[PDB]
Structure formats: C-alpha cells, structure tokens
Amino acid sequence: HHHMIVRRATYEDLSQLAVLFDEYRQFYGASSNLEESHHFLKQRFENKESVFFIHIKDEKITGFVLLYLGFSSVACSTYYILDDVYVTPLFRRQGSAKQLIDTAILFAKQENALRISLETQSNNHESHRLFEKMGFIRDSEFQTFHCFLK
Amino acid sequence: HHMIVRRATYEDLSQLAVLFDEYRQFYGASSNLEESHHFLKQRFENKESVFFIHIKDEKITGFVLLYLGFSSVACSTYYILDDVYVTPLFRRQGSAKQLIDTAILFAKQENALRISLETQSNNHESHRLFEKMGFIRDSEFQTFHCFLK
Ligand SMILES: CC(C)(COP(=O)(O)OP(=O)(O)OC[C@H]1O[C@@H](n2cnc3c(N)ncnc32)[C@H](O)[C@@H]1OP(=O)(O)O)[C@@H](O)C(=O)NCCC(=O)NCCS
Ligand SMILES: CC(C)(COP(=O)(O)OP(=O)(O)OC[C@H]1O[C@@H](n2cnc3c(N)ncnc32)[C@H](O)[C@@H]1OP(=O)(O)O)[C@@H](O)C(=O)NCCC(=O)NCCS
Ligand SMILES: CC(=O)NCCCN
Ligand SMILES: [Mg+2]
Ligand SMILES: [Mg+2]
C-alpha cells in the first residue's frame, strides 16, 4: 500500500493525464483543447516505442514524463529521448519532476540505453536547473536545423 | 532510367551496409561491417523509419535515413532527417540534393509539419547543404544528455 507513486501510465489514466498534457501544450503556446490533446495523447500512448511515466500523489496525477526510443547509427545502439516533462502548478517544487526523471533514468539503464537525450528551450532556465540537477550535460557540439513544410 | 533515388529494399542492404559503415567512420566509429549491417537491418525493419538511396548505374552512391517524430505542442507528426551520407567518389554531383529533395516530397505527401535535424556545428559542408535545401538554423532549443554508458 502506498500514498505516492511514479509508475507507467495505463489506458485508464489517459482521461486524467490529458488535462496535464493539455496544460503542457499551453506552456508551449498552444490553445487549450482538451479533446485534441486527449486524442493525440492516445496516439502517442499507442505508439510502440513510447513510454509514459506519471506521478500520482494522493490519487491525483501531479505530473508526467514522455520518453521514446532513439537509434544511434554511430554507436549502433539505442537510447531514450525525454520528449516532454510537466508538473501541474499546484504540485510544483515538491520533487515530482525529480522523481519522474529518476524513474526515467532507472528505466533507461534497465533497457541498456546509451543515454537519455532531450532538447528544451534556451529561454527555459527552470528546466535547465532541473536537468543539470539530474545529471544532464548541455550539448555544445550540435546545431539543430528545421525545414518548415506547413 | 540510369540513375534513381528510391526507397531502400532488403536486396540493397548488403551494399548499403558498406555506405552506412563509412558514415559511422566519418562520425568516429571503428569499421565493423557485421555490427553496421545488423543495426542497419534493425532500423530498416522499424515501421517508423524511411530509407532513400541514390543509385548511379546499380552502384549506391549515398543515402538518407528519416524517422517519424511527434510534436505534442502541434498535435501532429513530423520527420527527423537522422543520417545523410554520400560516398566521397560520388560527392559534389547533386546526390545529397536529390536525396533531400525526395525526403521533402515524401514528408509533404505524409502531411508532416517539418523535417528536423541535428548536425555538428563545425561541419561546414552539412550546413551549406541543409541551407541550400531550405533548412533554417535553429538555436532557440538547447540539447542536454545524461550519459549512461
Ligand atoms: C520544470 C518543471 C517540470 C519542474 O517540475 P517540479 O516538480 O516543480 O520540479 P522539482 O520540484 O522536482 O524540482 C527539482 C529541481 O528542478 C529545479 N527547478 C524546479 N523548478 C524550478 C524553478 N521554478 N526555478 C528554478 N529551478 C527550478 C531545481 O534545481 C529543483 O531542485 P530544488 O527544488 O532543490 O532547487 C515544471 O515547473 C514544469 O512543468 N514546467 C513547465 C514545463 C517544462 O518547462 N518542462 C521542461 C521541458 S520538457
Ligand atoms: C555532406 C554530404 C552529404 C554532401 O553530399 P553531396 O552529394 O556531395 O552534396 P551535393 O553534391 O548534393 O551538394 C549539395 C550542396 O551541398 C553543399 N555542399 C556539398 N559539398 C560541399 C562542400 N564540400 N563544401 C561546401 N558546400 C558543400 C553545397 O551547397 C552544394 O550545392 P552546390 O554543389 O550547388 O554548391 C557529403 O559531403 C557527406 O557525405 N559528408 C559526410 C557525412 C556528413 O557530413 N553528413 C551529415 C552529418 S549530420
Ligand atoms: C524536454 C523537451 O524536449 N521539451 C520540448 C517538447 C518537445 N520535445
Ligand atoms: Mg539517431
Ligand atoms: Mg516531440
């Protein structure tokens, strides 16, 4: 029996998780649309190489982390991408993101991943403090490029 | 036809492994055709991966490997241009240009938001290539890594 847990998300959690997923999208500039957020959360959940971990405190989902499998051609090995991390404001600064990333790290090690990689906004200093505390090192060697199609 | 940029098939993998091993060596890996081919086949069997090869008179001159990406913010998919390589003998002949032009057409057909990639900051050649193909340098995001091995 427990009162707090970080565990893999299930289909049964998607309805509650969609609210936090919609909040994460709003943080990134998106207009709130619970129905759209939920439909796409279901597509990502039903994607073979994606893994969602959620943080539940007193039966409430406080946050989540979405990871997906990466393939490193140079190393000829897999790794994990920490795609999205979010904690709802009511539960911030209580160690939720820390616990979510700690479980993400233990999971990646269990999967013999090379590393966990991510990209976060340069203007998001709060996230840089979180990732550095968790053992992430800033990549300097690479430059991102986008070719916009729509 | 005498030249073509097309999807890779199972039959191209023995020859494609040689190019993929060459691409690995450019990024500093030791040559190992068995390891290169085994991983190439694992990526080729991934349902979200897409390989295009440039073939000049039955010789593979180069390739591009793309994979599906999900944008949570846009609630839409996109493509990541993961690997691009042209064997030195066939360089500065438009092989990479044709591979990327095909990748863009494929991404548009798939209704992708964009094609995204990462390349070394000191790789002058790749920056000229991607800029020629309409890619824009983006420094609004910072990459972090948590090394496990
Ligand atoms: C960033 C975010 C995930 C942090 O979640 P959280 O549960 O509040 O974080 P924690 O309580 O585990 O904090 C862990 C560490 O992160 C850093 N951190 C977290 N919030 C911070 C803040 N507001 N300012 C500075 N550092 C902060 C600190 O180093 C902190 O350690 P400390 O509290 O001992 O100083 C949360 O604020 C959030 O959802 N933000 C919006 C989405 C986002 O930016 N995600 C990252 C990109 S995917
Ligand atoms: C980069 C690379 C793929 C280019 O392949 P390529 O088939 O020779 O390229 P193309 O002939 O299609 O050239 C397309 C454009 O790229 C640029 N380019 C290509 N080679 C270049 C070079 N040596 N110097 C400068 N710009 C160059 C030019 O803008 C060129 O247009 P142009 O020929 O009209 O001037 C090839 O040099 C290679 O395999 N390099 C090693 C692997 C690599 O760097 N891949 C990317 C790592 S993330
Ligand atoms: C950690 C992080 O990547 N945040 C941006 C969300 C799209 N990847
Ligand atoms: Mg890769
Ligand atoms: Mg994403």
Six-digit token pair at A58? 């007193």
Within-domain flag for A16: yes
Task: State the total domains in chain B.
Answer: 1
CA distances in angstroms from A149 to A30, A36, B134, B136, listed in the order given: 19, 21, 10, 12
Q: How far is the CA of B140 from the centre of ligand 3 (A)?
A: 12
What φ, ψ does residue A7 adopt, rounded to 5°?
-145, 170
- Which amino acid belongs to residue A58? D
Atom number of ligand 3 nearest to Cα A119: 3
Residues of A in contact with B134 (CB under 8 A): 147
CA of B14: how far to CAs of A11, A123, B9, B27, in Å? Answer: 41, 46, 10, 21
Task: Confirm if A75 and B29 have CB atoms less than 8 A apart.
Answer: yes
Chain A residues inside the 8 Å CB shell of B144: 117-120, 128, 131-132, 136-139
Which among A83, A131, A135, A86 has a CA at the least distance from the CA of A109? A135
Instruction: Tell whether B147 is covered by a domain.
Output: no
B140 part of a folded domain: no
Phi and psi at residue A117, to the nearest 5°: -120, 155
In which domain, by residue range, is B15 found?
3-133
Pairing label, strands A77-87, A60-72: antiparallel
Q: Which residues of B66-103 are buried (b: 16+ CB within 10 A; e: fewer)?
A: bbbbbbbebbebbbbbbbbbbbeebeeeebbebbbebb
Residue B96 covered by a domain = yes
For A109, B14, B102, B121, the CA distances from A120, given in Å and listed in that order, are 22, 38, 30, 18
- Asked whether residue A100 is domain-assigned, the answer is yes
The experimental technique behind this entry is: X-ray
* CB-CB contact of A112 with B130 (8 Å): no
Ligand 1, closest atom to CA A133? 29
Which protein residue's CA is at the shortest distance from atom 5 of ligand 1? A97
User: What CATH number corresponds to the domain at position A75?
Assistant: 3.40.630.30
Pairing of strands A115-121, A77-87: parallel
**Ligand 3 pocket check: which of A83, A129, A134, A136 to mutate, most ligand atoms within 8 Å of Cβ?**
A83
Closest by CA position to B13, among listed B40, B52, B43, B45? B40
Instruction: Tell which phi-psi region holds residue B90, choosing left (phi > 0), alpha (psi between -120 and 50) or beta.
Output: alpha
Asked, for residue A67, whether it belongs to a domain, the answer is yes
For testing contact with chain B, the best of A31, A76, A80 (most B CBs within 10 A): A76
Specify the resolution in Å.
1.9
- B104: amino acid identity, one letter: I
Q: Ligand 2: distance of its center to the CA of B89 in Å?
A: 12
User: B146 lies in a domain?
Assistant: no
In a mutational test of the A interface, the residue from B45, B64, B72, B83 whose CB has the highest number of chain A CBs within 10 Å is B72
How far is the centre of ligand 1, averaged over its atoms, from the C-alpha of A130 (Å)? Answer: 5
Cβ neighbours for B142, distance < 8 A, ≥ 6 positions apart? A119, A120, A121, A122, A128, A138, A139
Contact A61, A55 (CB under 8 A): yes
Contact between B66 and B103 (Cβ < 8 Å): yes
Q: Are A41 and A17 in contact (CB under 8 A)?
A: yes
CB pairs under 8 A between A and B: 185
Query: What is chain A's percent helix, strand, coil content, to nearest 5?
Result: 35, 35, 25
Q: From the CB of A84, is ligand 3 less than 6 Å away?
A: yes
Residue A78 and residue A70 in contact, taking contact as beta carbons nearer than 8 Å: yes
Q: What is the dihedral of CA A43, A98, A82, B35, to 10 degrees?
A: -120
Collapse the DSSP code of A85 into the 3-class scheme (helix H, G, I; strand E, B; otherwise coil) and give the result.
strand
Count other C-beta atoms under 10 Å from residue A87's C-beta: 24
- Chain A residues close to B28, C-beta within 8 Å: 74
C-alpha separations of A9 from A16, A41, A42, A51, B142 in Å = 11, 11, 11, 8, 28
Find chain A residues with C-beta within 8 A of B20's C-beta. 73
Alpha-carbon gap, residue A121 to A32, rounded angstroms: 20
SS (H, E, C) chain B: CCEEEEECCHHHHHHHHHHHHHHHHHCCCCCCHHHHHHHHHHHHCCCCEEEEEEEECCEEEEEEEEEEEEECCCCEEEEEEEEEEECHHHCCCCHHHHHHHHHHHHHHHCCCCEEEEEEECCCHHHHHHHHHCCCEEECCEEEEEEECC
B115-130: b (≥16 Cβ within 10 Å) or e: bbbbbeeeeeebbebb
Tokens 């590393």 locate to: A115
- CB distance A141 to B120 below 8 Å: yes
Please name the helix (run of DSSP H) or strand (run of DSSP E) that holds residue A69, with its range, or none: strand A60-72
Which helix or strand (DSSP H or E) is residue A71 part of? Answer: strand A60-72
Residue B64 included in any domain = yes
Looking from the CA of A51 toward its CB, the CA atoms found within 13 Å total 21
Q: Any binding-site annotation on B32?
A: no
Tokens in use for B27? Answer: 């990024």
Distance from the alpha carbon of residue A96 to the mean position of ligand 4, in angstroms: 29
